[PDB]
């Protein structure tokens, strides 16, 4: 989830163990980029489409 | 006088257990005397002051008719309860003389504390008669009544011969049971004597096993 936001925002994620970073905070940034907050995406089967 | 009552209760239980041992070995013992009430025991095996007399407790047992047919070699059995705690050579010497005098095939000796080595070494001294020593404390509770202990039945010479013949075995190929085994001592097994152990199996209900004394 952090890497997805970092790639979209062109930043380097802060994955240090003990910090104020939370999943909800990362989720808010991800939703601001037009993606589902929890990282789920709608995909299509490659064999049948 | 609480200790006096405790000793009487222990002695009564030991006497009750010894009766079962004689009865199970194949001797004519009636169930009535086996289940002798405690008050009746005090009325017959005590005196005015209360403390019991071990000498009067000694009795004689004879093989029952059924046992004779299966084992036509069993003789009389004499059970003696020693009075004084320390069993010395003198008491043992007269005890062994007592058995040999009246042609007692087997003699059971019940002591309180211990038998000294010089008395014990005299135990194998009157063949073919057999002498067995039992401690009073060990006889207070009958181990055979324990749920874990299965039923042991001694096999006759004919039965043992058929057992080996049908299974085509040898005496060394059978399971072994130690002579000093508490159950073996209870039944008075001898070398080469096989016992049928009929125990309850959770897979087949009843299972019969054989052990040869070693």
């Amino acid at each position: 989830l952090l890497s997805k936001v970092a790639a979209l925002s062109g930043n380097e994620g802060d994955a240090s163990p003990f910090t104020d970073i939370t999943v909800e905070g990362i989720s808010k940034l991800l939703r601001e980029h037009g993606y589902q907050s929890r990282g789920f995406e709608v995909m299509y089967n490659g064999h049948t489409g | 006088d609480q200790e006096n009552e405790r000793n009487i209760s222990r002695l009564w239980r030991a006497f009750r257990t010894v009766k079962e041992m004689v009865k199970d070995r194949g001797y004519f013992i009636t169930q009535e005397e086996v289940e002798l009430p405690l008050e009746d025991f005090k009325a017959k095996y005590c005196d005015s002051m209360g403390r019991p007399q071990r000498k009067m407790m000694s009795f004689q047992a004879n093989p029952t008719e059924e046992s004779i047919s299966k084992f036509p070699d069993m003789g009389s059995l004499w059970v003696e309860f020693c009075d004084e705690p320390s069993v010395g050579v003198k008491t043992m010497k007269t005890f062994v003389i007592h058995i040999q005098e009246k042609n007692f095939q087997t003699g059971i000796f019940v002591y309180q504390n211990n038998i000294t080595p010089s008395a014990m070494k005299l135990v194998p001294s009157i063949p073919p008669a057999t002498i067995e020593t039992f401690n009073e404390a060990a006889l207070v509770v009958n181990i055979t009544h324990h749920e874990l202990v299965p039923k042991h039945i001694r096999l006759s010479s004919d039965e043992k011969r058929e057992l080996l013949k049908r299974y085509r075995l040898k005496e060394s190929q059978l399971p072994r049971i130690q002579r000093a085994d508490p159950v073996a001592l209870y039944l008075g097994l001898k070398r080469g004597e096989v016992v049928k152990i009929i125990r309850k199996s959770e897979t087949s209900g009843r299972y019969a096993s054989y052990r040869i004394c070693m």
Binding site: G13, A15, S16, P17, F18, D20, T22, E24, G25 | -
Partner: protein
């Protein structure tokens, strides 16, 4: 660990002579019954004497170490309950740095001696290389802002995990983890950062505090088995 260092040891004699000049009574004239309150002074496990006012000696000894007269690697422990003062100078002891916390009654509560002014010059020297006066880790150590502490000396100090909440005298975001303040007003040191407890291999794991402990151990082993660029030559 990342910040762990191992001492090289120095001569203990200079410390022993200092103790004698500051009231360390020789052990040859020690009568236990005529002074049943003296503190036993130990240097490298050798009982060199007793001293009547252990508070003043410890304050003087600590001050000298902080300013730089005594080597920082020298470890000093005062067991108040046991009435023993132990000084260790031998090599092989493992120690790590920590912040120093002092009263500083200007704000009325204990606080780190290091301030934003110091951090300003720490970064100034860091970025000027890529010319202000040099200001390195040694300068902090000589200014009494950081202190080397080993396991033996860890026994007689109180350490605050973070200065954000533990040092200040004393809605909440539901996503944030539950933190214990411990409500202690006698802190003597402060961790540089809790994340420094980990080693080289464990420092590459992202969010190792969100993983089960066995998983962190396994990754440390597999990281050493990963293809990469060990050297540019």
């Amino acid at each position: 660990s990342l910040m762990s260092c191992i001492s090289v040891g120095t001569d203990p004699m200079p410390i022993i002579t200092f103790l004698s000049e500051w009231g360390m009574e020789p052990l040859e004239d020690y009568v236990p019954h005529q002074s049943p309150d003296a503190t036993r002074v130990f240097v490298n496990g050798v009982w060199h004497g007793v001293h009547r006012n252990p508070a003043r000696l410890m304050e003087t000894l600590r001050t000298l170490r902080r300013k730089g007269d005594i080597n920082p690697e020298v470890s000093m422990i005062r067991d108040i309950r046991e009435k023993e003062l132990k000084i260790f100078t031998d090599a092989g002891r493992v120690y790590r740095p920590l912040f120093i916390v002092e009263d500083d009654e200007s704000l009325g509560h204990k606080e780190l001696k290091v301030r934003k002014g110091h951090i300003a010059k720490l970064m100034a020297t860091e970025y000027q290389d890529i010319d202000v006066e040099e200001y390195t880790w040694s300068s902090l150590l000589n200014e009494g802002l950081v202190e080397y502490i080993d396991a033996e000396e860890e026994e007689s100090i109180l350490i605050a995990m973070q200065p954000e909440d533990l040092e200040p005298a004393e809605d909440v975001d539901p996503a944030k983890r539950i933190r214990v303040s411990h409500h202690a007003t006698t802190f003597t040191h402060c961790e540089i950062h809790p994340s420094m407890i980990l080693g080289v291999a464990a420092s590459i794991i992202p969010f190792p505090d969100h993983n089960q402990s066995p998983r962190n151990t396994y990754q440390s082993a597999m990281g050493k088995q990963a293809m990469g660029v060990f050297l540019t030559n």
